[PDB]
Design a binder for this molecule. Sequence first.
Ligand SMILES: O=C(Nc1nc(CN2CCCCC2)cs1)c1nc(C2CC2)cnc1Nc1cncnc1
Ligand SMILES: [Mg+2]
Ligand SMILES: [Zn+2]
Length: 318
Amino acid sequence: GLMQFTLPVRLCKEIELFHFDIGPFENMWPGIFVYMVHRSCGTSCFELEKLCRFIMSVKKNYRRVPYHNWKHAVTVAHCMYAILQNNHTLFTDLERKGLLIACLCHDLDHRGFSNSYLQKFDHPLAALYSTSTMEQHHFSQTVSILQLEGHNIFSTLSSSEYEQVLEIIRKAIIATDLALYFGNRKQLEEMYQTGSLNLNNQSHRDRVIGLMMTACDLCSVTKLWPVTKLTANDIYAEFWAEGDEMKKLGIQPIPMMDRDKKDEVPQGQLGFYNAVAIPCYTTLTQILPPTEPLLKACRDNLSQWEKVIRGEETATWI
Ligand SMILES: O=C(Nc1nc(CN2CCCCC2)cs1)c1nc(C2CC2)cnc1Nc1cncnc1
Ligand SMILES: [Mg+2]
Ligand SMILES: [Zn+2]
């Protein structure tokens, strides 16, 4: 009850910053998460013993893939921590509880393959869930772990608070399907500019939490350049394996996924920053001004990719 998590000084200070990298010591990531829950939520939010058991079953259900792994889960949860700590008074008690858990669980049992690949493969999950295929699976795995004996971290909530928090987690996890992000951001753009955006309107809060989930999910493009560049390598290791799997189904993959087209990566990163990431952090920053550092860091990384194209610097891995 009086048992705080404390980090070394460098981490205690840098964990507050948006561009924090959780480091290469896997055994420290659970304590980093619990530190963030304790400071974001309270030391009373969860029973420590149940939270620790929950965290360790979540870790076990992330696979050893290059990018959609346990390190990504914790990284996405940290970006949510930093957004919540910079916007203290905007979010409900149930939202603080739900959203860190949503981020930790948002890619549970990811196999390193896109929704597209599962549908072309004719995977059974593509018959069970016709849209947002992996994201419905991630939510389903979250509910499974929550129902394991001793894993119910929400056990002290009323029946209606429990339904509400699981509904926050379901929408937050579904929102990480980037297919849904484009229309969500367009609507948030119109709402903000015509001045109809209303944080008391539940359907408005839902849209804003969705955009927060996209922002946290993509946050590897908001790190210092050496982190972003080395993380780009991991996500392309997945993209290229999926492309290989498309060639095995007799389908030419898109270039992003074609390892014979490594030369096209710098230009593909430009399209990704201009079409997805910069617009995401731009609209986030309009709704939640204290999240501006994410936009600034994203613009810094677009500028490094522009330098890569002008040959003023390299990748190696390209
Ligand atoms: O590059 C990415 N996606 C990419 N998408 C393309 C294709 N492009 C998209 C925009 C419009 C034109 C077509 C190229 S790279 C990417 N995607 C995700 C999620 C959407 C799956 C997460 N992180 C990504 N990159 C990254 C870079 N550096 C560090 N960490 C992550
Ligand atoms: Mg995902
Ligand atoms: Zn993710």
